[PDB]
Amino acid sequence: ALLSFERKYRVPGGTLVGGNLFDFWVGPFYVGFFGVATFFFAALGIILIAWSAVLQGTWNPQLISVYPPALEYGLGGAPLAKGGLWQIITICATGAFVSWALREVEICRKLGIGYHIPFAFAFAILAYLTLVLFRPVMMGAWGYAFPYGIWTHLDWVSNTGYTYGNFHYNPAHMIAITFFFTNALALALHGALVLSAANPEKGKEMRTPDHEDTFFRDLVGYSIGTLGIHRLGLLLSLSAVFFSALCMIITGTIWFDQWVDWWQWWVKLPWWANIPGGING
Amino acid sequence: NFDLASLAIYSFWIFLAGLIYYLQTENMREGYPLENEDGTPAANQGPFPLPKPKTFILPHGRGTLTVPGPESEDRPIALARTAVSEGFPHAPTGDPMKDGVGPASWVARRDLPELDGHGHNKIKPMKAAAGFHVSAGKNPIGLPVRGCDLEIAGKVVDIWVDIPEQMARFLEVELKDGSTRLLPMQMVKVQSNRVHVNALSSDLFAGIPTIKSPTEVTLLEEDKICGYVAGGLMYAAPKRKS
Amino acid sequence: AEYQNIFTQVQVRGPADLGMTEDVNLANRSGVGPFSTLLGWFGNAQLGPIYLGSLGVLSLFSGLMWFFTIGIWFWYQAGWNPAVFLRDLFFFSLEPPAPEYGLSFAAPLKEGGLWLIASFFMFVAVWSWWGRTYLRAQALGMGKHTAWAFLSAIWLWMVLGFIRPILMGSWSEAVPYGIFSHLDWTNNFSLVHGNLFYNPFHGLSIAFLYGSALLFAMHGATILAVSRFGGERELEQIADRGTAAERAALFWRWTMGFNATMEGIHRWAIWMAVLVTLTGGIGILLSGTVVDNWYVWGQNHG
Numbered sequence: 049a050l051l052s053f054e055r056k057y058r059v060p061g062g063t064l065v066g067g068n069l070f071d072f073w074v075g076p077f078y079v080g081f082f083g084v085a086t087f088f089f090a091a092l093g094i095i096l097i098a099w100s101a102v103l104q105g106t107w108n109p110q111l112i113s114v115y116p117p118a119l120e121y122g123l124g125g126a127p128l129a130k131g132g133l134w135q136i137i138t139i140c141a142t143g144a145f146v147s148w149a150l151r152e153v154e155i156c157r158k159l160g161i162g163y164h165i166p167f168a169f170a171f172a173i174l175a176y177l178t179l180v181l182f183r184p185v186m187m188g189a190w191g192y193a194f195p196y197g198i199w200t201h202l203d204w205v206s207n208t209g210y211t212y213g214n215f216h217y218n219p220a221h222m223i224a225i226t227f228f229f230t231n232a233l234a235l236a237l238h239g240a241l242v243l244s245a246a247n248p249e250k251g252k253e254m255r256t257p258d259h260e261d262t263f264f265r266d267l268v269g270y271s272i273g274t275l276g277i278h279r280l281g282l283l284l285s286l287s288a289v290f291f292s293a294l295c296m297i298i299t300g301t302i303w304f305d306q307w308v309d310w311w312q313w314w315v316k317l318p319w320w321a322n323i324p325g326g327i328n329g
Numbered sequence: 330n331f332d333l334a335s336l337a338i339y340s341f342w343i344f345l346a347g348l349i350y351y352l353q354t355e356n357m358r359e360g361y362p363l364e365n366e367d368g369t370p371a372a373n374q375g376p377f378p379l380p381k382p383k384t385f386i387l388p389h390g391r392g393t394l395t396v397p398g399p400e401s402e403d404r405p406i407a408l409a410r411t412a413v414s415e416g417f418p419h420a421p422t423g424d425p426m427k428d429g430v431g432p433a434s435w436v437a438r439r440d441l442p443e444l445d446g447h448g449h450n451k452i453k454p455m456k457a458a459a460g461f462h463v464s465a466g467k468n469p470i471g472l473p474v475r476g477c478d479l480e481i482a483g484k485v486v487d488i489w490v491d492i493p494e495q496m497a498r499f500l501e502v503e504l505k506d507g508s509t510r511l512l513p514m515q516m517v518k519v520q521s522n523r524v525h526v527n528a529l530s531s532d533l534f535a536g537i538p539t540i541k542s543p544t545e546v547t548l549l550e551e552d553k554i555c556g557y558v559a560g561g562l563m564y565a566a567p568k569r570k571s
Numbered sequence: 572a573e574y575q576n577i578f579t580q581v582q583v584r585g586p587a588d589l590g591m592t593e594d595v596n597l598a599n600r601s602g603v604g605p606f607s608t609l610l611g612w613f614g615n616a617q618l619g620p621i622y623l624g625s626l627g628v629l630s631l632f633s634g635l636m637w638f639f640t641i642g643i644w645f646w647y648q649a650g651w652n653p654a655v656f657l658r659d660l661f662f663f664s665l666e667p668p669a670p671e672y673g674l675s676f677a678a679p680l681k682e683g684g685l686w687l688i689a690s691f692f693m694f695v696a697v698w699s700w701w702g703r704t705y706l707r708a709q710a711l712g713m714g715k716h717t718a719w720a721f722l723s724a725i726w727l728w729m730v731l732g733f734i735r736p737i738l739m740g741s742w743s744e745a746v747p748y749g750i751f752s753h754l755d756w757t758n759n760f761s762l763v764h765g766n767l768f769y770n771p772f773h774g775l776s777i778a779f780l781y782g783s784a785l786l787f788a789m790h791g792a793t794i795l796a797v798s799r800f801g802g803e804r805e806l807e808q809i810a811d812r813g814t815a816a817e818r819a820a821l822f823w824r825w826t827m828g829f830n831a832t833m834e835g836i837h838r839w840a841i842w843m844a845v846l847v848t849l850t851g852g853i854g855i856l857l858s859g860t861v862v863d864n865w866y867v868w869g870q871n872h873g
């Protein structure tokens with residue numbers, strides 16, 4: 049089934065691999081070679097999760113957890129039930145994520161649009177790889193990575209954070225959080241602005257983009273504009289995930305203490321470290 | 330075991346499901362009902378119903394829009410089925426750039442210019458926009474325009490500006506025969522000595538659709554222009570050198 | 572390397588846009604400020620004008636008072652020493668009254684009274700700012716979506732500083748005014764309540780915060796990818812669908828099986844973001860009033 053305007057876009061071409069072999073749709077879904085590759089990695093990764101759920105002995109999805117190998121295995125291979133399934137699932141998940149991004153590229157080419165979307169998606173893949181590949185390898189063991197379970201991966205977050213005191217004090221973590229908050233603020237503002245112009249007061253005609261700019265200038269003295277707000281949204285969400293990965297790649301590799309210590313440099317500079325009173329004297 | 334927190338979280342999940350059903354139906358106001366590839370309505374429309382119609386009152390006396398409503402392309406589509414079963418590409422029967430299919434597609438928008446809040450034309454050539462000038466970066470005007478065949482197609486003679494947003498939207502380019510075409514700002518590179526256009530070779534510039542007026546561009550025209558230029562990425566690829 | 576439309580290539584400038592008039596009292600609009608070429612590479616270069624009526628003046632006054640009340644306390648904690656001020660700036664904290672004072676407004680100045688005074692100023696500043704977001708939209712004849720969405724952020728702030736302390740019986744449950752101290756407060760809150768990761772409303776709040784970054788990345792990228800067809804002119808694309816809106820929709824339909832409309836994506840957007848603080852506020856509201864231990868509560872409900 050097609051959207052009413054869809055037929056004229058459903059032309060051949062745009063594939064990166066395989067010519068017209070996989071150039072077709074299943075329902076709404078475009079396939080392409082990397083659609084086949086995505087299905088392959090996804091199916092196999094989901095089978096292994098099923099296998100690992102049998103080894104664990106439960107069908108409850110809230111209890112299934114696929115753990116990486118013990119720290120003593122270092123960066124080596126592990127037996128399937130002792131961390132090996134986690135290793136293979138990580139390969140499958142990586143394969144599926146990258147295949148997904150390349151399928152998006154093919155869709156971009158067939159439609160003649162820019163490649164922004166798979167480019168933005170790559171930041172998320174990078175952040176995933178920071179936690180399961182880059183940081184574990186830099187620390188020397190797969191077991192520093194997180195487990196694949198709904199609740200166990202939260203326990204991992206809490207365990208990892210409190211290892212370094214209050215993780216709040218990690219300064220890259222502060223910047224990332226600021227981007228996450230500012231993004232959600234910008235998203236609420238942007239969705240509200242457009243809807244308030246398309247759906248004005250009762251008894252009114254549709255507003256114009258000029259009304260959107262006037263509203264924001266009246267409110268705060270500046271309107272970033274219709275193009276700028278979508279550039280800003282892209283930059284805010286990507287910068288949040290960039291500093292997220294930065295704040296984790298440096299933890300346990302170039303920094304091993306409680307993060308509150310990082311600021312204690314500012315506290316004990318020699319020209320005021322000893323001034324009595326305040327908080328630090 | 331039914332404390333107030335359990336009541337709250339169960340309640341939220343009921344609300345969220347209703348919110349999702351509402352959001353999905355709101356997003357079916359264009360393009361639905363689904364059709365078969367022959368254009369007849371599809372048997373399986375999914376589990377969400379069409380939303381009841383809503384009306385927008387367009388500013389400046391342009392009428393009303395009611396969605397959803399009976400849909401129509403209002404243009405011929407030069408494509409042919411390549412398979413009895415559904416799911417396969419439809420192939421161009423003619424010249425897809427000139428016929429406006431695939432990534433060269435355009436939509437039959439109203440043949441009227443977009444207006445600003447005051448009812449004046451939103452997009453005007455700089456040479457008719459009192460006060461407007463380049464303020465930073467390379468002024469392209471008078472630069473030579475170069476296509477993906479590394480040949481020269483013409484020179485920049487004006488900039489078409491979004492007045493309300495103070496933004497360059499189109500380069501007006503004069504061709505060897507003395508006529509002009511609009512080029513989308515988003516599809517060009519302003520360099521120190523030239524404007525480079527990767528999407529088209531020099532000899533496909535004259536096929537860019539033309540506008541009826543030297544001082545305004547309609548919504549229909551913008552779509553034809555932008556669709557044509559973007560379609561060069563797939564359909565001018567033979568003439569894309571190095 | 573193809574133009575990506577992340578930064579403007581060529582900036583253009585015209586006479587300053589003084590804005591739509593509608594029912595705006597033009598007496599209260601400022602003049603136009605300077606154009607910023609630096610800002611003009613990313614968005615609009617024009618600064619101002621701004622609207623400053625009674626509510627905006629009341630809001631800025633209350634807000635400065637709030638700021639200055641915290642600052643005076645910070646100077647007092649620094650023994651009036653400017654070097655101690657800069658050195659320990661992030662460590663100063665204006666804390667709420669001690670639990671002994673309950674909900675009384677009779678705490679001495681240096682033992683929580685200044686906190687109550689600051690909180691009063693911040694309460695007036697935020698609520699009058701809220702009234703401003705409503706009246707600025709009303710004066711242009713716009714929907715009230717911005718005021719409604721702002722109420723969601725206000726809800727979480729009201730729960731943290733005011734509604735939960737009241738239900739608990741003590742101002743000492745409220746959040747201190749300090750850079751580091753309010754981070755310490757946040758961490759202690761989770762520890763005292765048995766691990767906030769097991770508060771399901773916290774989990775939901777995180778899914779929408781992540782979901783908001785997911786969605787703005789998707790939407791901002793989509794619009795930039797179709798800006799070569801004028802896709803950012805979203806209002807006229809709502810009133811008269813163009814190939815930008817069609818290609819945007821078809822990208823996502825072919826990718827994940829369904830899609831939005833130009834109007835409808837902004838309904839996904841507003842709800843994704845407001846649900847962050849809506850659910851968050853409920854999660855905090857229930858902590859200590861109804862649930863003492865989220866982990867233990869979690870174990871007895873699966």
Ligand code: BCL
Nearest residue numbers: 216221222223225226227229230728731746750753754757
């Ligand atoms: C949600 C659970 C916690 C909490 C947990 C965290 C954590 C964890 C972090 C922050 C961070 C910050 N939080 Mg806090 N925060 C809470 C409630 C608040 C409230 C409030 C009204 O309730 C305020 C004003 C703040 C303020 C702030 C900022 C100092 C900073 C970045 C916010 C941001 O991105 O804004 C988006 C909005 C904008 C960017 C617009 C401009 C806003 C300006 C910057 C806010 C100014 C506040 C204050 C006047 C600044 C003084 C600066 C000088 C020291 C004088 N938090 C509650 C209690 N908050 C991060 C940080 O950097 O901490 C040091 C951080 O890591």
Ligand code: BCL
Nearest residue numbers: 172173175176205206208209214215216224225292293296
């Ligand atoms: C007690 C715990 C500690 C702490 C310890 C940590 C630790 C430890 C880490 C963080 C990290 C993060 N923390 Mg912290 N953190 C604390 C308190 C906070 C507070 C707060 C209000 O107090 C906030 C706002 C944050 C905020 C954040 C973010 C900056 C960041 C998570 C986002 C991210 O990385 O996304 C990145 C996005 C992804 C990883 C998603 C990738 C998705 C992939 C590409 C695709 C998936 C596809 C899927 C399988 C397919 C599904 C198919 C469909 C179902 C059909 N923290 C406390 C102090 N925090 C994390 C971080 O930075 O990671 C880099 C991290 O590891």
Ligand code: BCL
Nearest residue numbers: 094176194198199201202205773774775777778781782785
């Ligand atoms: C990013 C920083 C930390 C981390 C910290 C946290 C914290 C802290 C929390 C979560 C929460 C969640 N995280 Mg986690 N999480 C990390 C990495 C991941 C990865 C991954 C492959 O990288 C995935 C898929 C998830 C997935 C999840 C969900 C179960 C849940 C809500 C996410 C959400 O809505 O996001 C936004 C995305 C969307 C709204 C789109 C939909 C995405 C869907 C819902 C994901 C489903 C995945 C499915 C369960 C697994 C695959 C099934 C296949 C059939 C094999 N996390 C890393 C280690 N995550 C929250 C929770 O409630 O956990 C119980 C929570 O409180």
Ligand code: BCL
Nearest residue numbers: 724725728757758760761767768773776777780851852854
């Ligand atoms: C040890 C720390 C604890 C923890 C303790 C808490 C606590 C405590 C709280 C949160 C809350 C939040 N947590 Mg938690 N959190 C932890 C781990 C995490 C992790 C992670 C990866 O580990 C993540 C991603 C998060 C994420 C989040 C957010 C989803 C949520 C805050 C939403 C928001 O936008 O607030 C930011 C928005 C606001 C505070 C609203 C502000 C609105 C007002 C009106 C603004 C006034 C501005 C003022 C006037 C200044 C103006 C300046 C001028 C403009 C210049 N937490 C661990 C388990 N978390 C909050 C929540 O809702 O919990 C359910 C909360 O209170």
Ligand SMILES: CC[C@H]1c2cc3[nH]c4c(c3C)C(=O)[C@H](C(=O)OC)c4c3nc(cc4[nH]c(cc(n2)[C@@H]1C)c(C(C)=O)c4C)[C@@H](C)[C@@H]3CCC(=O)OC/C=C(\C)CCC[C@H](C)CCC[C@H](C)CCCC(C)C
Nearest residue numbers: 090093140141144148168169171172197198781784785788
């Ligand atoms: C970089 C900014 C943000 C971002 C952006 C972003 N995400 C994106 C995109 C973009 C631009 C897409 O185009 C793409 C998409 O298609 O969205 C609809 C995607 C997407 N982001 C997704 C999820 C997601 N994004 C997240 C985050 C973010 N995405 C960032 C905050 C998060 C979290 C936790 O924050 C999640 C869960 C998907 C909906 C989608 C990618 C879909 C995909 O890759 O499909 C192929 C894979 C499969 C069909 C299944 C693979 C299964 C594995 C083999 C087995 C399971 C492995 C897994 C590790 C188990 C995990 C257990 C958990 C409990 C830990």
Ligand SMILES: CC[C@H]1c2cc3[nH]c4c(c3C)C(=O)[C@H](C(=O)OC)c4c3nc(cc4[nH]c(cc(n2)[C@@H]1C)c(C(C)=O)c4C)[C@@H](C)[C@@H]3CCC(=O)OC/C=C(\C)CCC[C@H](C)CCC[C@H](C)CCCC(C)C
Nearest residue numbers: 229232233236630634635638696697700720721724844845
């Ligand atoms: C949907 C949830 C998200 C959300 C939404 C949201 N916030 C909002 C809104 C919405 C929909 C608004 O409409 C409103 C707004 O006006 O935005 C422009 C607001 C807003 N959210 C703000 C902040 C904010 N929101 C946050 C969070 C969130 N907001 C969530 C993530 C956070 C945090 C901690 O994450 C912060 C810090 C403000 C920018 C604004 C509310 C303004 C307000 O209430 O002001 C009252 C106080 C004053 C006017 C004076 C304060 C005193 C200071 C010394 C400043 C004044 C000095 C000088 C005049 C200005 C100088 C500094 C620079 C700005 C130049």
Ligand SMILES: COC1=C(OC)C(=O)C(C/C=C(\C)CC/C=C(\C)CC/C=C(\C)CC/C=C(\C)CC/C=C(\C)CC/C=C(\C)CC/C=C(/C)CC/C=C(\C)CC/C=C(\C)CCC=C(C)C)=C(C)C1=O
Nearest residue numbers: 077083086087416789790793819820823827830831832833
């Ligand atoms: C302005 O613009 C905008 C829009 O638009 C106008 C938009 O919309 C959007 C989009 C945004 C929204 C719609 C808002 C809502 C979205 C969110 C809230 C974000 C959260 C997203 C989700 C939670 C959904 C995620 C779901 C996913 C990831 C998809 C699930 C995946 C599947 C169910 C299957 C995946 C399909 C695969 C693997 C690809 C290949 C397809 C297959 C089915 C596999 C291949 C099968 C085979 C091998 C069989 C082959 C058969 C053969 C050989 C025989 C021949 C067959 C024939 C019959 C032809 C945005 C941003 C936008 O800003």
Ligand SMILES: COC(C)(C)C(=O)C/C=C(\C)CC/C=C(\C)CC/C=C(\C)CCCC/C(C)=C/CC[C@H](C)CC/C=C(\C)CCC=C(C)C
Nearest residue numbers: 638639641642690691694728729732733746748749750753
């Ligand atoms: C040179 O220095 C000068 C003097 C110029 C300065 O001004 C220096 C200024 C500073 C150093 C600024 C310092 C400011 C900060 C560090 C701000 C940090 C603040 C936070 C991190 C805020 C955390 C959260 C705050 C909260 C949750 C506030 C809650 C407010 C309540 C909702 C209000 C409830 C109302 C009450 C209790 C009053 C009741 C009265 C009624 C009428 C209802």
Ligand SMILES: CCCCCCCC/C=C/CCCCCCCC(=O)OC[C@@H](O)COP(=O)(O)O
Nearest residue numbers: 243244247340341343344345346347348351714
């Ligand atoms: C036990 C149940 C607890 C929760 C109770 C409700 C659960 C079921 C509700 C689900 C549906 C929620 C729909 C929310 C959005 C409704 C918006 C609407 O229809 O009216 C606003 C209106 O201006 C139109 O918006 P605009 O056109 O943008 O002004």
Ligand SMILES: CCCCCCCC/C=C/CCCCCCCC(=O)OC[C@@H](O)COP(=O)(O)O
Nearest residue numbers: 248249714715716719720722723726729841845
């Ligand atoms: C006591 C302090 C807390 C007050 C209440 C806290 C919870 C408030 C929650 C607010 C979120 C509301 C939904 C946000 C999106 C709005 C979508 C919508 O449809 O809004 C209705 C509005 O279009 C009606 O028409 P207009 O007013 O003309 O725009």
Ligand SMILES: CCCCCCCC/C=C/CCCCCCCC(=O)OC[C@H](O)CO
Nearest residue numbers: 237238241260261269270271272273274277
């Ligand atoms: C004196 C000037 C000082 C200015 C200080 C700003 C105040 C702080 C707000 C930041 C949020 C900015 C996010 C912008 C969100 C705008 C939402 C939107 O869609 O705007 C698009 C454009 O404005 C349609 O005309």
Ligand SMILES: CCCCCCCCCCCC[N+](C)(C)[O-]
Nearest residue numbers: 076349353374375376828829830
């Ligand atoms: C986690 C939030 C995602 C909710 C997903 C809602 C799915 C909508 C599916 C609608 C199907 C549309 N279709 C294919 C019939 O056209």
Ligand SMILES: CCCCCCCCCCCC[N+](C)(C)[O-]
Nearest residue numbers: 770771772774775778782842843
């Ligand atoms: C408005 C968009 C809807 C997105 C739906 C996201 C679903 C996330 C579910 C996370 C589960 C949290 N918890 C604690 C209830 O399990």
Ligand SMILES: CCCCCCCCCCCC
Nearest residue numbers: 124125135136138139142181
């Ligand atoms: C035995 C070593 C394999 C452990 C798993 C490594 C993770 C793979 C990352 C992506 C590779 C394509």
Ligand SMILES: CCCCCCCCCCCC
Nearest residue numbers: 075076077375827828829830
């Ligand atoms: C939370 C999981 C959301 C997954 C939704 C996928 C729906 C695909 C719709 C296509 C049906 C033909």
Ligand SMILES: [Fe+3]
Nearest residue numbers: 242790794805
């Ligand atoms: Fe938008």
